[PDB]
Design a binder for this molecule. Structure first.
Ligand SMILES: Cc1cc2nc3c(=O)[nH]c(=O)nc-3n(C[C@H](O)[C@H](O)[C@H](O)COP(=O)(O)OP(=O)(O)OC[C@H]3O[C@@H](n4cnc5c(N)ncnc54)[C@H](O)[C@@H]3O)c2cc1C
Ligand SMILES: Cc1cc2nc3c(=O)[nH]c(=O)nc-3n(C[C@H](O)[C@H](O)[C@H](O)COP(=O)(O)OP(=O)(O)OC[C@H]3O[C@@H](n4cnc5c(N)ncnc54)[C@H](O)[C@@H]3O)c2cc1C
Lengths: 115, 115
């Protein structure tokens, strides 16, 4: 009942996905080489500091199997959506339909339900 | 009424502070030089990608006035709390008492109200 408490593993995850997907959503469609490098490093460093040890370890192993594609906004928003679906699948959750990532994290549902 | 919508500036901020303060809260008390460097760069790169343009610009100017202290968990959790209070003050919000940052973001209130 008290809101202003340290987030548990689940609440930190929902915050963290919101942050990651929203950052990805506004990433350039034609990012410069430095931007492409900087976003790869950001994600690397996120994985180093993520504070749930079980989450961060599994994450670092995934990232070794699957390097972030930061070539464009389209590639990177998709990459990250596929990343998040691995974790969903691991945890017994359904796949999120990655064709919806712009509606979900940038533009709002096309039916106007976020307006 | 629909939860699964792109966060607005305020909702992204509350997610982002939760992430930043929770990362800081679990940062080492005696971090290695590389960890100290990595956390400085993480914060730098966060400021590059933060997607509210007005927020990110003001943030990058603050960070130029006030470089992150990543020497220890104590110094860095305090630094970040002072950073967040600048933004609070800017926006007409009261100061958060920085002596409470461990209770708020790591340990829970000492009265046990998060238990
Ligand atoms: C990097 C990272 C690693 C994690 N690793 C673990 C772990 O190893 N073990 C563990 O127990 N927990 C882990 N978590 C926490 C976990 O992934 C969830 O955040 C938590 O279980 C709560 O899940 P949820 O059902 O509320 O929705 P979440 O998975 O938090 O998702 C939040 C919202 O994102 C949207 N969404 C869902 N899937 C996608 C997608 N693929 N692409 C774009 N949007 C999507 C949906 O709207 C959903 O409601 C991790 C979190 C992060 C950020
Ligand atoms: C890096 C960054 C820069 C931003 N810049 C702007 C900007 O320029 N203009 C703008 O309008 N919005 C900005 N925001 C959004 C803004 O700071 C708030 O997140 C948003 O206004 C909602 O505020 P809130 O009252 O819900 O609480 P928030 O400020 O989001 O705080 C969330 C919670 O953190 C705790 N808290 C509050 N202060 C501290 C503290 N100092 N230390 C530790 N914990 C604390 C409290 O429990 C509070 O409920 C920024 C957000 C971030 C993350």
């Amino acid at each position: 009942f008290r809101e202003d408490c340290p987030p548990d593993r689940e609440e930190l995850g929902r915050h963290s996905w919101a942050v990651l997907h929203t950052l990805a959503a506004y990433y350039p469609d034609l990012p410069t080489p430095e931007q492409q490098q900087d976003m790869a490093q950001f994600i690397h460093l996120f994985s180093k500091f993520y504070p749930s040890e079980e989450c961060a370890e599994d994450l670092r192993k995934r990232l070794a199997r699957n390097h972030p594609d930061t070539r464009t906004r389209a590639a990177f928003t998709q990459w990250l959506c596929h990343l998040h679906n691995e974790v969903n699948r691991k945890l017994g959750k359904p796949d999120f339909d990655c064709s919806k990532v712009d509606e979900r994290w940038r533009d709002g549902w096309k039916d106007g339900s976020c307006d």
